[model samples]
Target chain A: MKILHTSDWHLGVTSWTSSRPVDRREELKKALDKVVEEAEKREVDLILLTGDLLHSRNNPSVVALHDLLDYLKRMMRTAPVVVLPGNQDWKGLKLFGNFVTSISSDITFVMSFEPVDVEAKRGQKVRILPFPYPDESEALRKNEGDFRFFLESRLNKLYEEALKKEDFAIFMGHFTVEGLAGYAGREIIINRALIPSVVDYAALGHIHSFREIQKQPLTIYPGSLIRIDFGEEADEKGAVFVELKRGEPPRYERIDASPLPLKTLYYKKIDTSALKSIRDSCRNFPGYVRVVYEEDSLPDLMGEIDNLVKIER
Target chain B: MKILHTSDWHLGVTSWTSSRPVDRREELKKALDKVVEEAEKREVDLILLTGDLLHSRNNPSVVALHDLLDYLKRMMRTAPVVVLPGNQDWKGLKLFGNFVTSISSDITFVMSFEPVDVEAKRGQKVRILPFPYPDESEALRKNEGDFRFFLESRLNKLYEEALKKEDFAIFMGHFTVEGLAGYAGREIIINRALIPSVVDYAALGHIHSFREIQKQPLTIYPGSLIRIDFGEEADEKGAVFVELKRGEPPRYERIDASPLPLKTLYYKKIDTSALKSIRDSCRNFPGYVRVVYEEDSLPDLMGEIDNLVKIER
Candidate 1:
C-alpha cells in the first residue's frame, strides 16, 4: 500500500505562537498543492493526514477549508483519505459531521480509539487504529483520573488488539512521542509515559520537524507542511511519502514542501551596513532575527527584522 | 429599487467571545439562507454587503465562500451585488482579492474610497460610495497622521464629489460611528468621528446589532446576519430590505434572519436542582451561560456550561 502522511496544516492560522501575523494561505496552498501533485504522480492508494488540520477548531479561515476540501476532493478520486484530529482541532471540537459530509466519500475521520476497517478501492481492508490528543472528557469517559496513564492504556489496548487481529494494519495518531525526537520543552511533549505500538506503520504528528523515530515496525513524524512557528527554525518542513508492503517494514521519504526557506538573522552586535546586507539577502521566508547587542536598536534594522522575524514567537 | 443590505456575516467563526466553541457554519448558514430567501422572494434589485464578510480577512472558510458564492450567484441573476471590507476583514488584511475573484461577475467589491456605479438589471444607475477599513500604509500615502481622519476626510471628499454627480447616490461603509443608535463600548465603535453624507441610503456593518445611524441619508447598521457575540444577546439579528426610487426618500425595514436564538444562563447562587433543569431545558444554540454564584463549583454543572459557553473570545 502506498500512503502519503502529512500533518499540522494549520490552515487559517495567521500566527498562533508568533508576535506578528502572516496570512499563510498562499504558502500553505503551495505546499498542499505539491502534496496533491505527488499523490497523483505516485498513484498513492491511501492518504493519512495527522491532526491539527486547522489551527482553531472554531475560527479556521474559509480559505483553509476551501484548500482542504479541494485537496481532499482531488486525492479521493485516486485514494481514500483518513484524518485524525489534533489538539487545536480538539479545542472544544464540534461534531462537524456535515462539514465532513460535504467532502468526498473516500474520506474517513478517525477521531477516537475505535479501530475501523477502511476498505480500499481494490477491496483491500486496512485496519486503522487511531488516537488523537486526549482531553479531560476522554479521560473521564475512560473512568481514569490520570490522563497520561489512561491514554497509554487505551493506546496499548488498541495496538495489542490490532496485533491479535491477524490483519494488515496501520496506526494513525496526533500526539507527542517521548524518546525519538530532539527533546525540547514540555508544552507539546506528552512525556508522562510512552505507548509504542506494534503496528506496521505509525504515522505521528505534532512536532514540526522531519524526524524518524522507529524502524522495524515503523513509526514516523512527518512534521508540518509549513514552518509555522520559530521553534521549528532549521527544521525541514515537509510531507512524507510512505511505501508499504505486508509483513515488510515501512519505507518513507521526506518531501520538501516549503516554498520559502526559513532564514534566521541572529547576527549579534551588527551595524546598519551589515544588517542591511542580511536584510537584502533575505527573501520570502519568516526570519527569526535575534539582536543580542546594546546597539540592537539600529535604525531601519529593527524595521526590517520586524517585517520578517516578528512573525513568530 | 429593492435592495437587501447586510453586514458582519463573520463566516467560519466558531467561538464568538464565548468559553466553548460552536460550529458557527451551521448557525451562520441558517441565517445566511434566510437572507438569500428574502432576496429571492422580494426579487431584489441589488445586494449591498457592507463588510466583515469573513471574520478573518486572510482566511475565510471554504464553506463560507461556497454558501456566499451560491447566494450571490442566485441573487445576481436579477440584481448586481456590491461588497466592502470591514475592520475584521481589515485585521491587517492581506490581498483577499484572490478569494474575492472566485465569485460571479455580477458581484462587485468596493474595497476602497472609490465611487462605483452599480447599474441594475432594470437599467437604473445608482452611485455607491464605499470605504473599507483604512490601513497605516494608506494613511502614510495620503501624508496623514491619523488613519481614521484620513479615511473620513477622503470619504467626505468622495461624497462631496458625488453630490455634484447628478445621480441617485447611496453611501456604504464598514467603520464605527460615534453617535449611532445602540452605542455601547468603544472597542469596535470607531468613534473618532462621523460624516453624514447627503445620499439616498448609507449601509454600514460591524457592531453586531441592527441600529439606525442616519435618517436624512438613511444610513443603517443592519448588524450581523446572526448574533455572533454575547454583547449582542438581546440585539435583533437580521437584515434590511431597502426600497428606493428616483428623487424620493428611501424606505427600509429590518427583516428577521437569525434561525438559532442566542440564549443565556446567568444564574447567581443556583444549586444543582435549578442548574440541571436549566441544562435539560436548553436546546438549539451556543449556551452563553455565566454562573456567578459563590458556590458555583457544582458537579457536572460547570461542565454543562463549559459545553456551549466556552467557545467565544
Candidate 2:
C-alpha cells in the first residue's frame, strides 16, 4: 500500500514580512490546490496529516475548517484521510470533531488511545498509531512536568502495545525533538522529542522541513505542506510518497510543491542606481507581490538589498 | 414542480443586545438545518435563494462561507439549489462561486444580463428572471442617476422581455417595499417593490419578514432564513414551499422554521423587585440569550433566575 504523508498546514497564518503583514489565506488557498492535485496524481492510497491544522485554535473563521473539510473530503474521494490534532488545536478534540463530522465519513480522526488500523487486501495490514499531542496537564502529571521524559514514555507505551501485533506499524506524531537537521525551520529546544527504535516508518510533524531522524526503519519528518513563513523562505515544501510492505520497511521520496513568491522586501536610501539593485533582488521571482510594501520614493526604486530589512533603524 | 424560496441570509451579522453582541451564526446554523430538512421532506425540485447571502458585503470569515457551502451542497444531494448575489456581496459573485464550487454540481448562480432558464423533463419550462442588485455605477448610468428610476426601469424591462414568452415565469428580486401586510420587519419606502401581475410567481427578498404582496399569482416575500434583530424578535422565521404547474399559477404555504428565542430586553432599577422581575422575565423560555448583560450588586442571590449570566463583574 502507498501512503501520502504531510503536516503543519498552518491555515490562516498571516506572518509579518519586512515590507508589511500579509494575509496568509490567499497563499494557503493556492498551496492547498497544488497539494490536493499532487496527492491524487501520486495515487497514494492513504493520506496521513500529522497536525497544526490551524495557526491559532480559533483564528481561522469557521470557514477555514469548512474549507479544510472540503479539501480533505475531496482527497477522501480517492483515498482515506486520517488526521491528528496538534498543539494549535486548543479547541480540544470535541470542538474539532464537530467541524470534521460536518462532511466526513471516510475521515478517521485519531483521538482514541488505540491506534487506527488500516487493512490492505492481499497484504499484511498496517496499524497507524496516531499520537495526538497530549494536553499540558496530561504531560505534567504523567511525566513529572519534564518534556523529554513525556515523549520517551509515550513512545515506549505505544510500541509496547503495538508489539502484540507489531512488525508493520507506522508511528504518527505532532511534536518537537532535540535532534539536529539544521535546515528545518523552528529548531526548538528538545520539547517532546521521540527517537523510535522498532517501526516501519515514523511520520513526524511541527518542524517545517523534510529530514531523516533514523535510518533503520526510515523515520522522516515530511514537514509542512507549504513554505509559509520567512523561516521557510528558501525551503522547498511538499508531501512524501511512501510504499509500505509487511515485514520489510517502507521506501519514500519527497515531492516539491512550493507556490509563487509571496513578497519582496526592498527599500532605497539612494537614488537612480538603487533601481537596478532592487530589480535584481526580485529578478527570478514570479509573484513578488507588494501585499504589504513600503518604498522610500516612487521615482527611484532599489531591489538589490537584503539588509534593507535590517532592524538598525 | 415544487420550489423552496428564501432570502437575506445576513450570515456575518452580530446583533447587539444589552450586554454583548450575539453571533447569529449559531441561530442561522439551526435554521439552515431545519430549512434543508423541510425542503427534502416536501420533495422540492428546486431551492431558490433570492439575495443577501452574507450580512455584510464580504464581512464573513472564510470559514463561514465554507460551512454554508457544506450545508447547501448537502441540500443539493436531494435537489437543485440556485442563488443570486445581492447588495451586501461586495466581494462579487466570483468569490462566492469559488466557495460554492467546492462541492456542488446542482447549484446554479445567475449573474448574466439575460435571465437563467430552468427546464424540467416535461411540463412547464420556467424562466427565472433574476434582477441581481446592480452596481451603483451601472444603475446610475442606466437610470439617469435616480436609484428608484433604475429599479423601475429594470422591472419594466424584465416585464417587457417576459411578454415575449410568459408561459411560466418567476420574478426573483432582492430590495425593499413601501406597502405591506403590516407584519414583515423592515418594510421601508418602496425601494424596488414589484406589482407585476403578469408573472406567474414572485420570490422577493431583502425584506426580513414573510408577507404576501399579491394574491392573484402568489407573489410573496419568503423573509430571512433566521431572525436578524430585535426588529425581528416577534417575527416567525422560515422558508416558503410553492407548487407550480405548466399553464396554471402556483399554490404555496409558509413553513415555520424558527428555532429559539435569541434575546429578551429587561430593565430592572430596584434591588429585590429587580431580581424577582429578572427571574420572571426568563421563565419557561428555552433559547433566551442576551449578547450583553448589565448587572447590579445583589442584595439577594439570584441563582434561581434564568436571565442571570455569570461573568464576575
Candidate 3:
C-alpha cells in the first residue's frame, strides 16, 4: 500500500512584521497541483494531511475556504484523502465542528477524538486512528500521572483494535512528540505518551520541521509545503511518500515541494572586509537573496550585487 | 519660545509587504519616543503634530505600537501636545485620534484643520495652516498643484529669514494641500506648494506619517507619538503644547496643548452573529475602539457610529 503524508500548509499567512501578504494563493495552487501530479505518477493509494492547514483560527473567507476544499476534492478522485486539523487552524468552537462535518462528503475529515477504520478493498485495508487536538484545556487537562494513564489507556484500545484487524494500520495525529523543540513562544505543546505504539506507521503534524520519532510506530512529520515565516527558514520543505507492506517496516521517500528551489537565502550581517569574496560566492546563485548591511558598508556592496534585494541600516 | 509641529506616525512601516527597518533601535526610541517627550514636556516650548502618524499598516504587532507610545508616554507627563495627521488616523487610526489626542493632553491637542496663529513674545509668532481633508480626487489633486506653487513663492520665502533666526516660529501643516502629496496612492496626496506656506509653523511630516522635510531652516516634524494604522485614521496620537499669543483673525488667548486621552481598543470578529452584540455592548462605552471585523456586515453596521475610532470591515 502507498501513502502520501504531508502537513503544515499555513495558507493565507504573511511574512514577518509586514502587511504585504505573500500571494501564496497561486503558490499554494501550484504546490497542490504538483502533489496531485505526483500522486498520479506514484499511483498512491492514500493521501494524509496531518494538520495545520490554515494559519489562523479566525475562519477564512467563504471563497477561500471553498477553494481549499475544492482542491482537496479534485485530488480525492485519485485516492482517498484524510485530513486532520492542527493548532493554527483549530478555533476550539463548536461552530467550526459543524462547518467541518457539513463539508465532509468525497473526502474523509477526521474531526473526532477517537480513530476510525477504513477498508480500501483491494488497495489497502488499514485501521485508521485519528487524534485531533483538544479544543479546550479541560478535554486534556489532568494531573501528570492521570494524563499519562489516560493516554496509555487510549493507545492500548487502538492497539488492541489494530491487532484484531491484522492489516496495515496507521496512527494519524496532530501533536507535539517528545524531544522536539518548537519555535520560541509558540503556543502548541504535546505530550510524548500520546503517541500510540501499536500502529505500523504514525503520521504526525503540528511541527513545521520534519523529523522521525520512535521506530515502533515509525512516527514521522512531513513538515509544511511552503515556508510560512522566517523562523521556519531552517526547515526542510517537502512531503513524505511511504510504501507499506502488510508485515514489514515502511519504506519512505521524500519529495521536494515544487516551483523549484524550495528555500531562499536570508542574510542579516555581512562583513565589509569579505565583500569581494561574498559577491564572488553569489556569482552564479539562482535563488532569491535578501541582505542587510550597515549604511557605511552599502556603497561597496551595491556595486557587487545588482539583482539582489538589499536593505540598508 | 520655539515649538515644533508634525504628525502621522505609521510606526510599523513595511514596504511592498516587507519590513523596511534600517534603524529599529533609534527609530522607535530616539526618533519617535524621545523626540515627542522632549519637545512636548521637558525641553521645547510647544509641539504641533499635523497628521498621519501611523502608516495604516495592519497586523497584531502594529497595533501594539500605539499602546507603547500613546498610553505609556501620555500617562507619564502633563505636557501640551497638538496633533492632526492626514486620513491615516483621522476617524482615529482604526477609533479616536481627535478625542484621544485631545484627552491625553488635557484637551491641548488641536484636532481641527482651521488656521490658528499665536503670538509667543514681542517678535516671535506661530501660525497653523491646517487642512483636514482636501476634496477627494479631482479637487484634491488640483489643490495639491496650487499648494506646490504657494510653497516655493510665498511660504518658502517667509521662512528664509526665520531659518536664520533663533527665535520661536511654528507652522502646522496637515493636508493634501498644493503639491505636497508626492506619492499617488489612495491614502495620501501632497501638494508641495502649501508645504512652505506654514513658514516657521511648517512642523510638517505626513508622507508615511512621520518625516522631516527640511532641517536647515528649523523646519521640523515633532512626529506623531502614537502609531496609527488606517487609511482614514491619519494623525499622531500626541499633542503639541505651545506658549503663544493672539494674532491674525482676532487677537485672543494664546493656546497651549493640554494633555489628552488616547486609547486603542482592538476588536476582531469571531462570528458573524456576534457583531450586533459587540456593538450593543460598546455603544455607550468611552474611549476609542478600533475593530477589525471578521464579518463584512459588522464594519458596515458599526461604521455609522460617531464615537468609534474606526471599524475596519
Candidate 4:
C-alpha cells in the first residue's frame, strides 16, 4: 500500500521577513495544491498529515482556514485523509474535527492519543497510533520527567492493545524525538528507544527539517511544506511517500514540493553604492529577499529597493 | 412525509435582559434536546432548521459552537437535516457550511439562494428553495428598490427551473414577508405574491414570534427556540413538525421548547416599600426577573435583590 506522509503546513503564518509583508495564505495555498497534485499523480492509497496544519491555535485567519478546509476536502476526494494536531493548532483542529467528522466518515482527525484503523483501497488495513502534542501545562503540573515516561508507556500500551494479526502498524505523532536540535524546555520530547520495533513506520512532525531518526521502525519527518522562517531557509521543504509491504521494511521516497526561494542579504554600510548593489543583486531574484543593515544607520535608504525585498536592522 | 422544522437557536446570546446575566447556551441546549426528542418521537423523514443558529454573526462562543455541532450531528443520526442562514449568522454560517458540507453529505447548509434536492429516509424527495438573508450592503450598493425586485425575480426564476414533477417543493428562507410585524427597513422583505405557487410549504425564520403567514402553500415561522430578549419575553418559543401530503395543505404541530420564564418588574420609586414589593413579587418567580425603576433614583438599592434578578433604570 502507498501512504503519503506530509506535515507542518503551518497555514496562516505571517511575514517573519523584516523587509516585505506577505499574505502567506497564497503561498500556503500553492503548497497545498502541490500536495493535492502529488497525491493524485502518485495515486497514493492513504494520506497522512502529521500536525501543525494551522499556524494559530485559537483563531486562524478566515481565508487561511477556508483554504486549508477546502484543500483537505479536495484531498479527501482522492484518498482518505488523516490529520493530527500539533502544539500550534490543537484547539482549532478540535473544532474543525468536530464539525467535519460528525458529517463524514472519510476524513479522520486525531485529536486524542488513540489508535484508529484505516483501510486502503486495496484492502490493506493499517493501524495508526496517533499521538497529538501533549499539553505543556499538564506536563508542568506533574513531574516533567515522570510525565514523559508515563506518556511513552501509555503510547506503547495503546500500540500493543491495537495490534491485529494481519494489520500493518504505524506510529504517527507531532513531537520531537531524542537527537533533534530544537527547544529543550516545555515541549513534548520522546526518547528514540520508546518507539516500538513492531511498528512498520513512524511518520513524525513538529520539526521543520526532514530526517530519518531510526531504521527499525523507519521513523521520519517529512518537514514543513514551506520555509516557516529564515531559520529554516536552508532546509529543503517537501513531503514523503511510503511503500509498505508484508514482512519487509517499508520503502519511502521524497516528493519535492518546495515553495518560492527565500534569500537574505547583509550589508555593513548604507550608501548610493550599497543601494545600487542591493538592487542589482535582487532585481532578478525569483523569490523573497531580506536585507539587513546596521541598526542605527539610514533606515529609509533601503525603502528605495523593490517591493520584492524587505529590510531589517 | 413528515418534516421537523425548527429555527432561531441563537446559541451565544448574552444578558439581553436588563435584570440577570444568562448562559444562554444551556437554555439553547435544553431547547435543542427537545428538538431532538420531537424528531425521534415523530420519526420525521427530514429535519429543517431555518437559520440564526448562532447569536453572533462572526464569533460564536466556543462552548456554543461545540454544543450546536454536537446537536446537529446527533440529529443527523435520526434524519437528514437542512439548515439555512438568517440575518444574524450568515457569515459564520457560511464558514461552518464550508467546513462541514465538504465532508458530510447528510447535513446540508443552505448558504446560498439556490435550490437543493434532498431525499428523505422514506424515499420522499424534496426540492428546497433556500433564501438566506440577503446582504443589506449589497442591496444598498445597487438601487435599494431595484435590488428587491431583482432578487424576487431571480428567486422566482430559480424556483421555476428547480421544479421537478412528483417532488415535494418547499420555500425555506430567513426574511420578512409583507404582513410580518417587525423592522420595516433595510431588512429582506419579500412580498407574499413573490412566493411560487408550486411550493407545498414555506419554512420561514428571522421573526422571533411564530406565525402562519399563508395557508394555500402552508407558509410558517417556527420562531426562535427561546425568548431572545425582553421584547420577545411574551412570545411562545418552540419548533414545528410538518406533515406534507400530495394534495392536502401541509399540517404542522408546535413542539413547546420554551426556556426559563422571563419576568419584568417596574416601580415608580426606590424605597423600602418598593424594594419589598419587588422582592415579594420575584421571590417565587419561576424565571428571570428584571427590575425597572424611575430614572435618577437610588440605583444601588436594587442590588439587594436575588441574583436571579437584574436591575435597570
Candidate 5:
C-alpha cells in the first residue's frame, strides 16, 4: 500500500516583514499545485496530512478558504485523504472540527484519540490509532506526559486487540520525539520512549524535519510540506512517500517542494574581505533570511545586502 | 493653510467575492501610495483622514498594521497628519490603543467628541471642533430632533468660543445627516440655523463621496481615499485638496484617483433580448460585479458571459 505523508500547509500566513505577502501566497499556491501533480504521477493510494494545515485557530477569509477546500476536494478523487489537527489549528473548543466538517468531502478527518479499525485491503484489517493535541481539558494538561501515555495506552490496546484477530496496525499522531534536533526549535519534542513497540508503523507530524525513532516497529516523521516560520527555514521542505509492505519495513521517498524555495541560510561570523563574496552568494536566496553577527564587524553590511528582500538582524 | 482631505482607507480589506487576498492588499497599497504621491506633489501643509481607516475594529496582524503605518510615516515628513475615529474604529471599553499608536509620526488622532484648537499657517488659530462617533451615551442618542438639538448646542459653544477669540473656525465630524441627498448617502450636514453665521468651513468624513451641504458655512465631505465596501463602488474616489484663505471661500480642487477603476454593476432583466446586450456591456467591466436577473429569461445563456468573475443569481 502506498501512502503520501505531509503536513503544515499554513495557509493565510503573511511574511514576517509583510513586504511580500502577495508573492508568498502565489508561491504557496504553486507549491500545492506541484504537490498535486506529483501525487497524480505517483498514483498514491492514500494522502495523509498529519496536522497544522492553517496558521491560526481563527477563521480565515471565506473566499480564500473556499478556494483551498475546492482544490483539496479535487485531490481527494485520486486518493482517500486523512487529516489530524495540530497545535496551530487547535482551539480550546472544537472550532477546527467545525471548519473541517463544513468543507470536507470524501475526506476522513481523524477527530478521536482512540484507535479505529479499517480494512486496508480485502479482509486485512489495519488498526489506525490517532492522537490529538491537548485541548482545554484539565486531565490532558495537568500532566505533561499524559499525551504520550494516552497514545501508548491506546496503541497497546489496539495491538493486543488486533493480535487476537491477527491483523496489521498503524499509529498516526502529531507528537514530538525527544533527541531529534532541527533548526526549528525543540518545543515539539515528546519523550521517544513513550512510543509503543507493538505498532507496525508510526507516522508523526509537528517536526519540520524528517526523523526515525529507534524501535522494532518503524516510526517516522514526514516533516512539514511547506516552510513557514524562520525556525523551519534551514529544514528542507517536502513530504514523505511511504510504500507499505504486508510484513516488512515501509519504503520511504522524500519529494522536495518546488517554485518558491522556502528556505533559510545563516551566516554567523565572516571576515570583512569575504563579505562581498558572501553577499553575492546569498543574493539568489529564496524567501526570508535571519542574520546574526557582531554589529561593529560590518558597519555597511546593511547596504551590501541589497538583494535580500527581508533581513532579520 | 493647504489641507488634504482623505478617508476610508480600509486597510487589511479583502475583495467580497474573489479568493485574491494578496491582489486586493496590493491594490489597496497602490491606491494609498498614489494618494501619498499626490499629497507630496500638492505640498499640502496638513493631512486629514476622516474615519474607517481600518477595515475592522479588531486590529489586524501587528506586521500588517505596522507596514501600513510605516507607509503613512513616510508621507508624514511632508506634513502633519490628523485622523478621527469613525463608527468602525470607535473607542469602546474593549478597545486597546494599538491602532492609534501604531503609526510613528507627528500625527494627531482625535478620539473625543469635544473640539480642540490648532495653529494653522501664519499663526491663524483654527478652532477645530471634532465630533467623534456617538457611542451608547444616553445624552447623544435621544430622539432624532433632540439628538440634533444637542449636537447643534455643542457646535454653537465651539463656534461662539472661536468667534470670541476672532479665530477661523472649522468643524470636523462623522455623522449621518438628514434630508441632504447624494449618490454616496446622507452626509454630516451642519444645521445652518445652529451656526453663528461666522464659521468659515466644515470638514466632514464618514460619507464615501464628496459633497457640499446647503448651509450658511460651507460643509464638505472629501470622501474616502480608496473604495472600500461594494456600496462605495459608485462613488468617485478622491481627496479634496483645500487652501484655507483668510476672507474668501476655501479654494478647493478635487484630485482624481488612479485610473484603475472599481466598478460594481447591479442588473435586473427587463426582457430576454437584453441579455446579449448586457453581457456585451459588461465584457470588459473591471473590479467586482453583482447581478440579479430573471432566471427564466436568461435560461442557460448566462454562462456565456466572459470575464464575469462573480455572478449572483
Candidate 6:
C-alpha cells in the first residue's frame, strides 16, 4: 500500500511574505495543485495530512476554505485522506466537516487521540494512531500539572496499545521534537526518546523544515508545503511518499516541489546605478523580492524600486 | 418506526429569567434527562431534534457543550437521533462533533439543505429532507436578488425532488412560518402556502411556543423545552413523538415536560403590611419569583423582600 504524507499547508497566511504584498492565496493554490497532481500521478492508496492545514484556527479566509474543500474533493477521488490536526489547525480541523457537510466517504478527520483502523483499497490493514496538538484546556481538565510528562505518558500508552494486535501501525503526530530547530517557545515539545520502538513509522509536523529524527521507526518530517518567508529561503519544500508492505519496514522518498522564487539584496551605498541595479535584480526573478539598505537618507526616486520590491532601511 | 421530535434546547442561555440568577445548565440537564428517559421507555426507533440546540452560536458555554454531547451519547443508545440546525445554533450544530470526536454512530447532524435517506432498526426506510436555518451569508452567495423568494424557490425544488419517491418523508425545517407570531425581525419566514402536500410531516422549530399550522401533512412546532422568559409563562413545553409506517400517514403526540416553577406578582401600593403580604406570597412558591410595583420606594425594609424576589419598583 502507498501513503502520501504532507503537512503545514498554512493556507490563508497574509503576512508571511515580505515582497510587495504577494498574494499568498495564489501561492498556496499553486502548492496545493501540485499536491493533488502528485497524489494522482503516484496513485497512492492513503494520504496523511499531519496538519496546520489552515493558518488561522478560527475564521480562516473564505477563499482558503474553498481551496481546501476543492483540494480534498480532488484528493479523495484518488485515495482516502486522513488528516491529523496540528497546533495551528486543531480546532478548525476538528470542525472541518461543518464547512462542507457533504464530503466524500473516503475522507477521515482524525480529530482525537483514538487509534482508527483503516483498510487500503488493496485490502491492506493499517492502524492510524492520531496524536493531535495537545490542547491545554483539554489536557488541564484531565491532568493538572506537568503537561509535557502528561502528554508523553499518554502517547506511550497509545503506542503500546495500538501495536498490540500486530497490524501495520503509523504514529501520526503534529508536535515539535525537543531538539528540533524550529518554532521556539509557543510549541509543545516531546522528547525523542519517548517515541517507542514498536511503532512502525512516525509522520510528524510543526517544524517548517524537514528533519529525520530516527531510522528504526522511520521518524521524519516532510516540512511545510512552501517556503513561507525569507527565513525559510533555504528550506526544501515537498511531501513524503511511503510504500508499506506486510512483514517489511516502510520505504519512503521525498517528492520535491519548487517554491516561488524569492530574492533579498543588501546594499550599503545608494546612487542612480545602485537603484538601477536593484530594479534590474528584481526584474531578473518574476517573484517575491526584498531590498535592504544601510543608508539613513532617502532617495526621492526610490518609489520606482519600492513599487517593485519590499524595502527595509 | 417511532421518532422523537424536539427542538430549541437553548442550552447556554444566561439572562432569560427575571428572578434570582439560576443555573441554566442544570435546568437543561434535567430536560435532556427526561428526553433520554422518554426515548428509552417508549422504545422509539428514531429521534429528530429540529434545532436551536444551543443558545450561543460561536462560543457556547463549555458546560452546555458537555451537556449536548452527553445527551446525544445517551439518546443514541436508545435510537437514531437526527439533528437539524436552527438560526440560534446553525454554526454550533454544524460543528457539534468537534466537541466530542468519538460520538456514537447513530447520531446524524444534518448541516445543509439536502435530503438524507435513513433506515430504521425495524427495516423501515424514511427520507429526511433537512432545511437548515436560512443563513443570509449562505443565501446571498447563491442567489443575490431576493432572499425570501430564493429560499422559497429552493425549498420547493427540494420538496419536489425529495417526494418523487414513494417512501416515508419528513420535512425537518428550522424556520418560522409566515404568520406564526414569534421572533419578529431576526427570523427567516416561509409562507404557509408554500408547504407542499406531498410532505408527510413537517417537524418544525423557531417559534418558542407550540402551534400546529396544518392538518393534512401534520405541520407542527413542539415549542421550546422551557419557558425562556415571562413572555412565555403560559406556553406548554414538550417534545413531539412521531410514528411512521410505509403505507400510513405519520402519527405524533406531545411528550410534555415540566419547567421550573416561576411566578410574577404585581402591586400598586407598598408599605409595611404590603411588604409582609408580599413575603407571605413569595413563601408559597419554591421556584423563581418577581415583583412589580407602581410606587416610589421609601422603605429601607424593602431589602428583606428584595432578597426573596426580583424587585422592579
Number of the top lDDT candidate: 4
TM-score of chain A of each: 0.82, 0.76, 0.76, 0.89, 0.75, 0.87
- Pairs of residues clashing in candidate 4: A19-A310, A19-A311, B19-B310
DockQ category of candidate 1 = incorrect
Supply candidate 1's per-residue lDDT for A266. Answer: 31
Task: Tell me the tens digit of each residue's lDDT in model 5 across B40-136.
Answer: 8878877777776666565565555675567667757777666676765523411333354445335666666566665543455666667765432
- What DockQ, on C-alphas, does every prediction get? 0.01, 0.01, 0.01, 0.01, 0.01, 0.01
Residue by residue across B117-209, what tens digits does model 4's lDDT show? 888878888888877776545443442222434676777775685577356888887776533110100234465557777788888887766
**Candidate 2 segments whose C-alpha is farther than 4 A from its true place:** A1-313, B90-95, B98-105, B120-124, B134-143, B180-193, B262-268, B289-313
Pick the winner on TM-score between candidates 3 and 4: 4
CA lDDT for candidate 3: 0.49
Mark the 10 consecutive residues where model 5 chain A has the least summed lDDT: A179-188
lDDT of 5: 0.56
Candidate 6 residue lDDT tens string, A1-313: 7888988888888753544455577766777788779889989988888888888867787888777777877888888777887667736557755343336447777767777777665566778887876653444244232344456677877778666745578888876554311011023345555676677788887776665667778887887777665555445677889887767877988877667755555555555656676667655565666555554555644455543445665
Model 1 whole-model lDDT (C-alpha atoms): 0.62
The prediction achieving the highest TM-score against the true structure is 4
Candidate 4's interface RMSD, please? 30.2
Instruction: Find the 10 residues in a row with the least total lDDT in model 3 chain B.
Output: B177-186
Interface RMSD, Å, model 2: 27.6
In order of TM-score, best first, we have: 4, 6, 1, 2, 3, 5
lDDT of each: 0.62, 0.59, 0.49, 0.70, 0.56, 0.67
Residues A1-313, candidate 2: write the lDDT tens digits.
7888877777766654555445667767776777778777877777878877777664566666777768777888767777777777546544666566456655667764567676432244667777765444343233231233444566778777567554467778765543211110111122222435566777877666665555665766776665554334333467788887775657888876665543423332323543454455446655432211233335312244322222111
Name the runs in model 4 displaced over 4 angstroms: A1-313, B17-20, B90-92, B141-145, B180-185, B299-302, B307-309
